[PDB]
Amino acid sequence: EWSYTNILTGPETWHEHYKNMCSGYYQSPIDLKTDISTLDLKLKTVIIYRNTSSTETTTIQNNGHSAEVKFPRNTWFISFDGILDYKYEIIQMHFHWGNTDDRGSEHTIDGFRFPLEGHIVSFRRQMYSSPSEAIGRPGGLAVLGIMHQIVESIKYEQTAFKAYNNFSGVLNSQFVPPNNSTIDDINLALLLSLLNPSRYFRYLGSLTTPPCTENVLWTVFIDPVLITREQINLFRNLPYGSNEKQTRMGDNFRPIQLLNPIDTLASRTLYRATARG
Amino acid sequence: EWSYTNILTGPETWHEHYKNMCSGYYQSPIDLKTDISTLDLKLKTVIIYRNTSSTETTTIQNNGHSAEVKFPRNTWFISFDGILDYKYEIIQMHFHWGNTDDRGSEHTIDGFRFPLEGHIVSFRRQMYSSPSEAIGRPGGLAVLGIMHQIVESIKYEQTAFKAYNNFSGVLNSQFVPPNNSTIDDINLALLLSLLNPSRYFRYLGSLTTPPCTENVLWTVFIDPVLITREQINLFRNLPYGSNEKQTRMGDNFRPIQLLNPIDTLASRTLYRATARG
Numbered sequence A, B: 001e002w003s004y005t006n007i008l009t010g011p012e013t014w015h016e017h018y019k020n021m022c023s024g025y026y027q028s029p030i031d032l033k034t035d036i037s038t039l040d041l042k043l044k045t046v047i048i049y050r051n052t053s054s055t056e057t058t059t060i061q062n063n064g065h066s067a068e069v070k071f072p073r074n075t076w077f078i079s080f081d082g083i084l085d086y087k088y089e090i091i092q093m094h095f096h097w098g099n100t101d102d103r104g105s106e107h108t109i110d111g112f113r114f115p116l117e118g119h120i121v122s123f124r125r126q127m128y129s130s131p132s133e134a135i136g137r138p139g140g141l142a143v144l145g146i147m148h149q150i151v152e153s154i155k156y157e158q159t160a161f162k163a164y165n166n167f168s169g170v171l172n173s174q175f176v177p178p179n180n181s182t183i184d185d186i187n188l189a190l191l192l193s194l195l196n197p198s199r200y201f202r203y204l205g206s207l208t209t210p211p212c213t214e215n216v217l218w219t220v221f222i223d224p225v226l227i228t229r230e231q232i233n234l235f236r237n238l239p240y241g242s243n244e245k246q247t248r249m250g251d252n253f254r255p256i257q258l259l260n261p262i263d264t265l266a267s268r269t270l271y272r273a274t275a276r277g
Ligand SMILES: NS(=O)(=O)c1ccc(CCN/C([SeH])=N\c2ccc(I)cc2)cc1
Pocket: A063, A065, A066, A068, A092, A094, A119, A121, A143, A206, A207, A208, A209, A252
């Protein structure tokens, strides 16, 4: 299959093992360059919102490459246009992090890596009726990237882990793949309120794992939410799957792709949003 | 379930009848605006080329919406990069025309409508192993648009119909849907030589019939190839399918779409190409 740390199956090989579409020219992640991006004032504040009549359980799984929160259907949503009419429905949230505090994110901002990048994955329910219809089809997906940065002095209640409800304690050395547990729901609205939801990069790109499908509308918020060293080390306690060379989970990020590889047949543009000033 | 001329199922209904993806904001055709386009000097001359070991027959069909030439698999190819390594494989070519000489094309160039636009449809064999795998998948298709203009004085051999080998004389009132006929092969290399293959518009868009899939790399050549009044009339003798109101096939084109409708979440750019000069 594929891995992050086994040189035989790792990211440098994906273009060959998964030509469709890891060999394409609209890949992610990229370096988000503030100076080489176009400000687009039409891009509105992002809203995350919940169907309050949903009662189904949230679960989490160590799938061998990340910790992935699976949300029940019809429960959490994204609006990019201020209307709460269920155009984008959230499916899951997973994470990318480093062996050390100075790396881990997949995207960079002006060359800078964060310790932890969370990915809220949604499908365009406006057009497609289910996650499995959308996931392999054009324009099917929209992902939100949330950067986290480590602070030494902070109350629990002001960290991202309050929104995550500490993942109900599941991040530990005994959370072996492919175990899954029920967890308290993640308050994704609170999470979003920990940063500026108007201030983000926006571009068309891909999944960052095989098969690297080029059907993702990316939104990467510029301001990070805050965590402690203790919290980042929790993720580091998870074991990798048996496909990986490294034992403990870490450095589960894809290397940086160019916005426009030289063989592109139609250049893409990196956009930036900011609040109505 | 769709038509051009029957108001129950015509183009104004497709946004509603085929939400995925005729309701999208990366639709085709568009007005190709010379002033509001970005010149990109990296976009190279287009080459069309044949596999000379191929012997299978070419056919043409009245499918009720157009005349469609169907090429055998593994026979005709496009290269956008100068390498003849089968990255794009040609599937079919079909046509859009008007009831009258002053309309017919799907794309316009600076608001101008041509009497006939041909579409040479290919799949990205580089990533996808068959047409049916590519047709519904991200980035699966590339279409070349060839404008045709009517002239009064020309030798047959210098008209696009020479490249088409007159469609082997098959076009007449009795060529009813869904009949197909064997025809002499189309010399697509001659066709391309009748215009400047370095001079074109390029953008990411969609199929121009339902379901309007947003997975088409578009290339529309700026210079038209030339035909006669008699030749355009050959198309107009074809009968439309029963789902249409009009009897004789014509005005089989979709209305112009905006490059960036107001609901877009990431603007696209119209590019143009010209020869190394
Ligand atoms: N990284 S991403 O946001 O572009 C991304 C988002 C979704 C998918 C679809 C398949 N993957 C599913 Se359903 N779950 C996982 C996702 C990532 C990882 I690492 C592990 C499991 C791939 C990649």
